[PDB]
């Protein structure tokens with residue numbers, strides 16, 4: 001019971017943290033698209049994700 | 062696992078263990094009070110050494 | 123082809139321009155100035171910028187609240203609205219290139235020319 | 242070697258405390274663009290009921306739109322200021338006539354994807 | 365392992381002092397961009413902690 | 426959507442059966458699992474029969490059962506704000522604040538204007 | 548064995564109402580668009596002939 | 609505080625008397641461009657097709673598609689350059705210049721003359737691979753721009769008026785021709801721009817509309833650094849153009865950084881070095897001296913890989929800096945000495961890197 005209370009606590013929280021990282025992250029992706037800084041980023045972490053055709057392929061799979 | 066607490070039927074081990082937990086609780090009360098104090102001055106940028114009148118710089122220290 | 127949503131305005135598929143004034147010169151030629159949707163520069167419909175319109179790189183429109191549109195737009199607009207707040211309706215007419223006359227406005231199944239259209 | 246009166250500049254590692262460390266413009270709805278979401282209507286002051294609704298059909302089929310009454314509009318630029326409009330229908334005309342669909346427009350760019358001869362993103 | 369890890373991190377903490385990573389540079393500009401990548405990372409860390417505390421807490425040791 | 430995998434963990438780490446929605450019920454072949462597949466352990470319940478067995482101990486506790494009622498009470502109230510009825514509550518709140526003004530004036534001499542609020546969709 | 552099948556079916560039907568009663572109609576309209584394009588892309592690459600389906604979504608009312 | 613730049617290079621050469629080589633270059637830099645307007649993007653295309661072997665004439669094309677601070681800018685050129693003699697080279701071509709809603713076309717009849725201050729036998733005998741050759745170039749220009757726009761007419765009227773009223777037009781035109789930082793580049797590459805000479809500024813009627821016509825002639829001298837003068841014969845492998853050759857490149861720039869892509873085949877990549885040994889063509893000095901002008905503003909770390917592919921049976925006799933690794937016929941450069949030489953030449957250095965490959 002104790003082993004299930006600790007394991008689940010750090011798993012629900014982990015899942016919640018991942019969801020918020022994507023949320024607060026896309027919350028920043030909105031600020032840049034609005035200001036136009038989105039096209040100015042050089043990181044493979046944003047550049048390889050600004051193509052609409054590539055998006056619908058990733059989401060498609 | 063760390064020896065602060067012990068699984069013992071004897072009341073003596075149960076009384077000795079209690080003193081250890083009470084000691085760690087008071088210790089965390091002292092260290093917590095320092096971190097809150099060190100969390101008020103940083104928040105209010107009032108990071109002045111009370112002993113030596115000179116304050117510190119965040120960018121270069 | 124076409125630029126992405128991130129480049130320029132996202133809503134637009136091609137760049138957008140609005141004819142903002144249509145004053146005439148001493149000779150009666152129609153001086154057309156069109157500014158882009160962003161609106162920081164003034165252009166005239168030169169062949170080089172018309173040439174973009176042939177390939178759909180840009181699109182040009184006119185508001186119906188223009189001070190000098192010449193034609194009585196409000197009455198006609200009010201009639202159509204009544205057919206199917208009525209006053210204050212505003213529309214954007216899509217200007218198109220007619221090789222014979224240049225820029226024409228297909229208003230109410232009747233082709234018009236910017237000089238004929240504007241005062 | 243004489244000098245001028247000292248410049249008091251404590252920027253780096255220093256024991257000194259640092260510092261805290263009119264109806265001119267007009268607005269319009271492009272009715273063909275409007276989707277009637279009414280985000281503009283709620284920015285208009287309630288004692289100046291300029292923006293309003295106009296119905297002519299079923300809402301699920303774009304049967305409703307918003308419009309500014311210019312007779313009561315006071316040109317406070319609240320509807321335009323906040324970048325509410327998702328379609329570009331809400332536009333602004335400056336006193337000298339330029340038409341702005343959005344308060345700031347990102348700069349235009351070419352587009353190409355950068356690949357490498359021998360790195361992970363090859364060819 | 366509290367001392368082995370203190371040696372790995374200190375050596376790793378000096379290499380990044382002389383050679384700071386240029387990956388995800390756009391993050392250095394905005395707080396929420398970096399705070400979100402940290403939260404996407406901490407969540408997978410928490411899920412991992414939850415998954416090892418299940419295998420480990422019922423080991424013979 | 427994450428509540429499903431967040432529940433496949435709760436069910437799986439409690440020794441519950443996840444291969445069938447019904448395991449261990451007094452029915453046709455639910456109790457035949459342990460020997461058809463030769464399992465060394467016996468899982469507490471199946472996806473549906475989990476709620477019946479696990480709750481025998483919840484109902485025996487006067488505090489674990491208070492959580493069952495509070496937790497259920499909190500959950501359904503989500504439907505009131507998650508359903509597409511935001512507009513209805515607003516016109517209802519109007520009748521609320523109108524009725525309070527009416528009752529307060531007819532009974533008392535004071536004017537009761539509270540302007541009942543309603544949350545926005547977001 | 549039959550009163551329990553009703554229990555399962557009846558619960559399955561009821562929660563599906565959440566999908567059409569939650570304010571996620573705009574999300575369903577977008578999602579389907581990805582599905583139509585995704586299916587069109589899969590059919591295109593996989594078969595010489597290109598077949599599209601234009602997946603439909605219910606209206607709020 | 610140091611930023612990082614990543615780059616990859618590739619040269620594939622054929623055997624025999626062929627000077628044909630394929631060059632591919634990819635680069636990515638994290639520092640802001642020196643351009644005072646951003647973002648500035650640009651795509652360039654060059655194609656050369658041989659017209660006839662005996663004449664030696666070739667057709668060269670150039671397209672420039674650049675967006676500068678949201679302002680579309682395009683320049684197009686189509687020309688016919690051929691070798692007349694050892695020092696003269698005539699070109700006939702047409703082109704178009706478009707900026708936003710403005711555009712104007714032009715036609716030119718031009719010849720370039722290139723002379724070396726001296727030509728001594730001892731220099732040739734005692735120096736196996738000379739770099740600096742001192743010289744001067746002379747351009748004969750006959751521009752033909754139709755005055756279609758209202759603005760063109762005004763630019764022409766103004767120009768004629770300026771010439772008529774200002775005696776110092778031949779001198780002060782060099783302040784206009786080289787705008788902003790372009791003026792500073794002249795002194796930097798040891799290049800002297802002489803005063804232009806206007807043979808004639810006459811309006812001649814054309815079937816379309818009045819055509820402002822300019823017939824001018826200028827000169828410019830190189831202390832030896834300039835590659836157009838020092839290497840006049842090498843930059844035009846017309847006779848080696850057995851098949852069409854194309855160089856395609858482009859770049860994206862903004863506050864965050866620069867992304868550059870370059871690819872294309874052309875002859876002259878490999879030149880004889882003596883004693884039966886071949887060698888990659890000496891690096892152009894003008895590009896390096898011109899990039900040191902903008903490459904010295906941000907401390908950077910170099911990550912460059914240069915993959916060189918040789919013909920079957922063809923093995924390096926000597927390279928400095930030496931190739932890090934080898935893969936049969938392919939040889940690789942990365943790290944160590946090479947990523948010092950890259951740091952050298954990206955900041956304006958012109959230090960020699962020589963590869964000799966013999967059969």
Ligand code: BCL
Nearest residue numbers: 015016017018019020021022023024027028396399403406
């Ligand atoms: C719950 C589901 C999401 C979530 C959804 C949202 C939403 C929705 C909002 C924020 C907002 C905020 N979030 Mg978040 N956020 C989550 C997880 C986190 C975690 C974390 C513990 O890992 C942190 C540090 C943050 C950080 C923050 C701040 C950047 C910001 C303002 C906080 C505030 O004033 O709270 C309130 C301050 C208090 C003192 C109340 C108690 C808050 C306690 C301390 C918990 C903090 C995190 C919590 C989610 C904050 C919002 C509570 C609201 C009721 C939703 N989020 C998860 C992943 N977050 C806001 C914002 O501006 O986003 C751009 C916003 O609108």
Ligand code: BCL
Nearest residue numbers: 654656670685687697698699718719720828836853855874
């Ligand atoms: C840049 C250094 C020199 C220069 C170097 C040369 C060279 C070298 C020669 C010319 C010659 C010419 N020059 Mg000049 N020229 C300069 C300045 C000028 C200016 C000016 C605006 O001031 C003008 C109007 C001219 C005019 C002219 C033309 C009359 C003529 C042919 C040009 C042409 O077709 O380009 C085509 C249009 C382009 C945009 C091409 C640009 C090419 C760039 C510079 C290099 C690309 C090659 C790349 C490195 C390798 C590619 C291989 C592929 C197979 C192509 N020169 C400066 C001072 N000039 C040519 C001649 O002799 O005519 C008889 C010729 O051989």
Ligand code: BCL
Nearest residue numbers: 018021022025026044045046047048049388397401404405
């Ligand atoms: C190790 C990765 C880290 C992390 C590191 C980062 C970094 C760094 C950044 C993001 C940023 C973003 N991240 Mg995060 N982030 C994490 C967790 C997540 C998860 C998740 C899986 O739960 C998601 C959905 C997101 C989502 C997002 C967005 C909120 C945001 C902008 C989109 C983006 O980056 O497009 C980019 C997506 C692409 C460009 C497409 C994919 C790129 C290549 C293909 C990925 C490499 C795969 C490689 C080939 C391995 C293949 C295996 C085989 C053996 C080949 N993060 C994890 C823990 N996150 C960006 C940001 O600015 O945030 C503020 C950003 O710079």
Ligand code: BCL
Nearest residue numbers: 613615635639640641642643790859861868902903906954
């Ligand atoms: C911090 C150190 C960085 C660095 C910092 C910068 C910065 C900072 C900038 C560049 C810029 C550039 N860098 Mg660098 N750069 C680095 C390393 C590289 C590497 C590499 C790793 O191999 C590459 C491929 C590049 C490539 C480039 C180009 C994209 C660009 C210069 C364009 C050009 O040639 O204009 C050629 C220009 C001309 C020919 C002049 C045109 C105008 C004049 C008036 C024309 C007169 C000529 C006459 C008309 C010609 C002949 C006519 C014909 C004969 C007819 N850099 C290092 C690692 N680089 C600059 C740039 O422009 O960025 C956009 C810039 O500001």
Ligand code: BCL
Nearest residue numbers: 725726730731732734735736737738739740741742832960
């Ligand atoms: C660190 C750089 C290297 C170097 C790098 C290069 C490179 C790279 C190249 C040359 C090339 C040349 N080299 Mg070397 N060269 C070096 C040292 C020398 C020395 C020497 C005794 O130190 C000599 C005689 C030379 C000689 C020469 C020329 C043969 C040639 C340039 C042709 C030319 O037009 O020049 C003729 C002379 C001049 C142009 C200037 C006149 C000499 C000076 C200016 C005046 C001398 C005065 C002297 C003190 C006499 C007293 C004066 C009294 C009043 C009489 N070099 C230094 C050590 N040299 C080039 C070549 O091979 O092309 C064929 C070339 O590409």
Ligand code: BCL
Nearest residue numbers: 631652656689835839842843844845846855857875876892
């Ligand atoms: C009118 C212009 C001239 C011209 C002027 C020059 C100049 C000047 C140079 C060359 C250079 C080269 N030329 Mg040439 N060249 C012309 C026509 C030709 C012909 C032909 C007649 O068929 C041939 C065979 C070549 C072949 C070559 C190569 C031997 C060499 C490039 C090496 C390489 O691949 O680097 C691989 C790298 C690349 C392909 C990068 C290319 C980058 C972009 C596409 C071009 C940038 C030019 C400038 C910086 C920016 C553009 C300015 C324009 C005004 C738009 N050119 C015409 C006649 N050429 C160089 C050299 O050393 O020659 C001996 C050199 O400095």
Ligand code: CLA
Nearest residue numbers: 498499501502504505506508510512513514515516517518
């Ligand atoms: C327990 C749940 C609950 C309660 C108390 C209410 C109450 C109400 N609803 Mg809601 N509603 C609910 C669930 C609930 N609803 C759900 C699940 C849905 C989704 C289908 C809706 C959808 C909905 C719509 C669409 C509308 C409303 C409206 C109304 C109001 C009109 C009825 C009225 O005036 O007095 C009814 C009588 C009472 C409220 C007496 C009070 C009953 C108890 C004592 C309330 C206190 C208990 C509470 C749960 C304490 C919380 C404790 C905490 C730990 C959670 C009223 C305030 C209408 C309105 O006017 O909106 C403002 C309206 O238009 N209802």
Ligand code: CLA
Nearest residue numbers: 426559560562563565566567569571574575576577578579
């Ligand atoms: C069993 C319930 C169920 C199922 C199958 C789905 C399935 C789906 N949802 Mg939904 N959803 C549900 C419940 C469900 N949802 C609930 C309760 C909510 C409210 C929170 C939502 C809210 C919602 C939103 C907001 C969105 C969707 C979207 C989607 C689609 C994207 C996922 C995908 O492409 O493949 C997922 C994988 C599958 C579908 C595999 C099939 C799984 C089984 C085999 C389906 C057949 C079983 C079915 C119950 C049979 C009915 C029998 C009958 C007696 C009732 C997908 C069709 C997104 C979308 O694109 O909309 C079109 C979207 O934006 N979901």
Ligand code: SF4
Nearest residue numbers: 285314316317318320
């Ligand atoms: S300017 Fe002010 S009053 Fe006029 S429509 Fe906009 S928000 Fe309303």
Ligand code: SF4
Nearest residue numbers: 275279281326330331
């Ligand atoms: S915000 Fe835009 S879409 Fe919404 S009503 Fe106003 S003009 Fe129409």
